Amino acid sequence: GSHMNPPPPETSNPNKPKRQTNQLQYLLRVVLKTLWKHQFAWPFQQPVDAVKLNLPDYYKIIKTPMDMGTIKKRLENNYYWNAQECIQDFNTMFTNCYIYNKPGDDIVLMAEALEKLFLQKINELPTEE
Ligand SMILES: NC(=O)c1ccc(I)cc1
């Protein structure tokens, strides 16, 4: 894409140790699955394209970007060591939205719907076995 967008977050790095856990499996099969198909998922399914959206200040404000397209790749391509890393990525994505946008903007209401679902699912994150 544009040189004016940053490179996306890291999704493949052989030097980073990887592991499957039952909790990571749940994050892919239950959490990402649920949120990805939500009616309000589409703004969150790829990195913010600040050029196409005419938001030239986006990456001036948001220095820790994250999105569900990146999280999907990290889950599918076994990037994580533990569930906390992936939960933190979801939380970063929501917080970016809430920091950049005005409360009550459509995108914020969309993020909040996804976050409510997220919280319900993470409350049932299975005990690590
Ligand atoms: N700012 C927005 O509402 C928005 C962000 C990403 C996409 I793709 C569409 C809209």
UniProtKB/Swiss-Prot annotation:
It comes from the Eukaryota. Belongs to the BET family. There is a cross-link at residue 60 (Glycyl lysine isopeptide (Lys-Gly) (interchain with G-Cter in SUMO2)). The gene is BRD4. Ubiquitously expressed. The chain holds residues 44 to 168 of 1362 of the full protein. JQ1, a thieno-triazolo-1,4-diazepine derivative, and I-BET, a benzodiazepine derivative, have been tested on tumors with success. Treatment with GSK1210151A (I-BET151, a I-BET derivative) has strong effets on mixed lineage leukemia and promotes myeloid differentiation and leukemia stem-cell depletion. Disulfide bonds: none annotated. Signal peptide: none annotated. Interacts with p53/TP53; the interaction is direct. Interacts (via CTD region) with CDK9 and CCNT1, acting as an associated component of P-TEFb complex. Interacts with RELA (when acetylated at 'Lys-310'). Interacts (via NET domain) with NSD3, CHD4, BICRA and ATAD5. The interaction with BICRA bridges BRD4 to the GBAF complex. Interacts (via NET domain) with JMJD6 (via JmjC and N-terminal domains); the interaction is stronger in presence of ssRNA and recruits JMJD6 on distal enhancers. Interacts with NSD3. Interacts with NIPBL. (Microbial infection) Interacts with bovine papillomavirus type 1 regulatory protein E2. This interactions may serve for the tethering of viral genomes to host mitotic chromosomes allowing successful partitioning of the viral genome during cell division. It is linked to Cornelia de Lange syndrome 6: A form of Cornelia de Lange syndrome, a clinically heterogeneous developmental disorder associated with malformations affecting multiple systems. It is characterized by facial dysmorphisms, abnormal hands and feet, growth delay, cognitive retardation, hirsutism, gastroesophageal dysfunction and cardiac, ophthalmologic and genitourinary anomalies. CDLS6 inheritance is autosomal dominant. A chromosomal aberration involving BRD4 is found in a rare, aggressive, and lethal carcinoma arising in midline organs of young people. Translocation t(15;19)(q14;p13) with NUTM1 which produces a BRD4-NUTM1 fusion protein. It is found in: Nucleus; Chromosome. The NET domain mediates interaction with a number of chromatin proteins involved in transcription regulation (NSD3, JMJD6, CHD4, GLTSCR1 and ATAD5). Chromatin reader protein that recognizes and binds acetylated histones and plays a key role in transmission of epigenetic memory across cell divisions and transcription regulation. Remains associated with acetylated chromatin throughout the entire cell cycle and provides epigenetic memory for postmitotic G1 gene transcription by preserving acetylated chromatin status and maintaining high-order chromatin structure. During interphase, plays a key role in regulating the transcription of signal-inducible genes by associating with the P-TEFb complex and recruiting it to promoters. Residues 19-125 form the Bromo domain. Changing residue 106 to G: Found in a patient with a neurodevelopmental syndrome; uncertain significance. The record marks 101 as: Acetylated histone binding. This is Bromodomain-containing protein 4. The lineage of its organism: Eukaryota, Metazoa, Chordata, Craniata, Vertebrata. Phosphorylation by CK2 disrupt the intramolecular binding between the bromo domain 2 and the NPS region and promotes binding between the NPS and the BID regions, leading to activate the protein and promote binding to acetylated histones. In absence of phosphorylation, BRD4 does not localize to p53/TP53 target gene promoters, phosphorylation promoting recruitment to p53/TP53 target promoters.
